[PDB]
Design a protein around this ligand. Structure first.
Ligand SMILES: [Cl-]
Ligand SMILES: [Cl-]
Ligand SMILES: [Cl-]
Ligand SMILES: [Cl-]
Ligand SMILES: [Cl-]
Ligand SMILES: [Cl-]
Ligand SMILES: [Cl-]
Ligand SMILES: [Cl-]
Ligand SMILES: [Mg+2]
Ligand SMILES: [Mg+2]
Ligand SMILES: [Mg+2]
Ligand SMILES: [Mg+2]
Ligand SMILES: [Mg+2]
Ligand SMILES: [Mg+2]
Ligand code: NA
Ligand code: NA
Ligand code: NA
Ligand code: NA
Lengths: 384, 384
């Protein structure tokens, strides 16, 4: 009975960061401040543990007591498919409180537990494809900060810096409300043009613009991009409208990648394939409810001969990318000229995603998700 | 470097069995005789091993030297996705000699190696869904043996015996060439009717008839089955004709399950979904080239809200079934009144798929594929 789960614990602590998020949830650099972060730990009878990080609200007591403990406590931690399906089955009746985000953090902690228990990196447990992978530099949403990301030329200048660092691909997130004047298709296209001019024709370029443009605006945006040789256009319209995506992909030459944010996990992504709503699939550990369903989406895409690009940084997504073939990149970011991504986080002793000078991220040879957790730091900065 | 593969070995030995196969490859009971069986072993630097069984021609020296050793030797055994993809990439150019069957046995040996090395059953490594699963009794193709499977009533009588044993579902394979008079739709339907009459309405019944009936014959067969409340009709036409399956499923009420034998692995099975060629998907470790692609097919089906029924017995298929939710059964057989399935194989010390009196197969709690291999027997019966 050593593999039986005995405890599920949440520890909330303060991390020091210059990352802020606006009222619409878009990241920006700002003053150094303390932000509450949560760590979920699952422990078995023999004392082995697995951990994963998320925002405090996602693993608050209501959700832990009503849902997570009831599924996990007393169960064999290795039964990840059974445990995931049990949580999935309870979402419909949860009064909207048991979210895909909660499933993701629980599933990730279970994977970390298995890996740490076995002394194996998660991607090796899954079945490894690659130990290193090209990353694109994923640039934060636009701002109104002088010298930051306020003008089209600001994007161009930051792009030059990213190429020097070794990134072989660059993705722009452009300007979005509550930036006062946003959104503006002409401004987005000017940023795209400035970046292409700055880096030349051989760096791969992507755009993830305002996520709710009308069909007419997204068509104008996509048309403007075809002149610049961009690799993909990402979520330019409300992803709840599958029909809009069928229409847009039919009317654009540039590949459309999606859905990133849409609900329904791997099931809904099958619908995007069936309906021809995208040219490249998208998934992400946080978006589909864990490593387990992310892997399902990767396999789904592969069976159709499609790529499936993995949204988001951190170990959980990196291990999905390392375990699969049909994904061009790891998404490294979000990045901003004012911030030093390579410095990492105060609660981790080293980076989960170190990148060489040629633009390859190397998966750490550490067990589980391989997050090098500074438990002492967390203990010293607990939220009472 | 303890995880690095150092050796790939094939040991051919004689097993004593009453299973024969006719000229078309269909199994039948006959005289006790000795049949050559091959065991593939993969070994790492630290001396850990994994094993899998297949027919000698599938792992003959030509294939081992030209393909398998070149991919595996010197590589990290845990990189199953990379190694599978490397073998897949070499099939096209192999002058038809590197088959999906060869990929399957190699992939299975790699999974067994990881499980044995970690002390974990393969389904627990994948992420377990169930430790036991309902099995259907899968009846051998028809014969002309008196009291065997020669008449419709013979099927009825054997069905009664299987229900007593505890099977909750039963699948008929009916009469096929070179049975002198075969095939005959009317005879197949008589067997189906005899079985339904024998077992009543609450036992689940399936039919896997002659695999190459015309559209007109398969329509007549399927129409006759709807009167008997059968759960599915399996491969009644040449599976190379996707279009025939679209047509047949459109014209039958009874669910069509497939494709079992078609080439193209998980990719081709996506096409069956996209085209609406079946109501229930089919896969199998031997049919799609290993546990790795079988899992991909399971996930593909699940994303469409479909079941995917796993073809074939033995540990390799049982572990796929135990790791996934969207499959109703393990296929236990093939069975015949003249043969005692529960006696197992002379080269295994116990059954990979023991079944209780309620019709549940219990996955052995043994590492890797959990095949309880009698190495001494194999050594004593080697083919010189
Ligand atoms: Cl709460
Ligand atoms: Cl940076
Ligand atoms: Cl770095
Ligand atoms: Cl520490
Ligand atoms: Cl040979
Ligand atoms: Cl039997
Ligand atoms: Cl048994
Ligand atoms: Cl032995
Ligand atoms: Mg995005
Ligand atoms: Mg298009
Ligand atoms: Mg740090
Ligand atoms: Mg069959
Ligand atoms: Mg139908
Ligand atoms: Mg035996
Ligand atoms: Na977007
Ligand atoms: Na399209
Ligand atoms: Na058939
Ligand atoms: Na159909």
């Amino acid at each position: 009975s050593h593999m039986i789960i005995t405890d599920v614990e949440v520890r909330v602590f303060r991390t020091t960061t210059r990352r802020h998020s606006d009222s619409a949830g878009h990241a920006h650099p700002g003053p150094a401040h303390q932000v509450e972060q949560a760590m979920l730990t699952v422990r078995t009878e023999d004392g082995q543990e697995g951990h994963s990080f998320t925002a405090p609200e996602i693993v608050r007591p209501h959700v832990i007591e009503k849902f997570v403990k009831k599924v996990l406590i007393g169960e064999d931690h290795r039964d990840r498919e059974r445990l995931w399906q049990d949580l999935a089955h309870w979402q419909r009746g949860s009064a909207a409180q048991l979210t895909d985000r909660t499933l993701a953090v629980v599933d990730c902690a279970l994977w970390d537990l298995a890996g740490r228990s076995l002394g194996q990196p998660v991607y090796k447990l899954i079945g490894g494809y690659r130990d290193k992978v090209l990353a694109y530099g994923s640039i934060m949403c636009g701002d109104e900060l002088e010298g930051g990301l306020a003008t089209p030329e600001d994007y161009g200048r930051f792009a030059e810096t990213l190429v020097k660092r070794g990134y072989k691909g660059i993705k722009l997130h452009t300007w979005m409300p509550p930036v006062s004047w946003a959104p503006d298709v002409k401004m987005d296209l000017k940023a795209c043009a400035a970046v292409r001019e700055a880096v030349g024709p051989d760096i791969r370029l992507m755009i993830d613009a305002f996520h709710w443009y009308s069909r007419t605006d997204a068509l104008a945006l996509g048309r403007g991009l075809e002149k610049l040789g961009f690799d993909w256009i990402e979520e330019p319209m409300d992803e709840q409208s599958l029909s809009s995506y069928k229409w847009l992909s039919d009317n654009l030459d540039i590949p459309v990648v999606g859905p990133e944010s849409a609900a329904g996990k791997h099931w809904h992504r099958a619908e995007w394939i069936k309906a021809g709503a995208c040219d490249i699939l998208r998934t992400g550990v946080n978006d589909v409810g864990g490593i387990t369903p992310a892997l399902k989406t990767m396999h789904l895409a592969e069976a159709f001969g499609m790529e499936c690009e993995v949204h988001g940084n951190t170990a959980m997504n990196l291990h999905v990318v390392a375990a699969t073939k049909n994904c061009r990149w790891y998404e490294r970011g979000l990045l901003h000229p004012f911030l030093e991504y390579d410095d990492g986080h105060d609660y981790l002793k080293s980076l989960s995603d170190p990148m060489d000078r040629d633009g390859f991220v190397h998966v750490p040879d550490r067990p589980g998700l391989g997050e090098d957790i500074d438990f002492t730091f967390i203990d010293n900065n607990r939220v009472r």
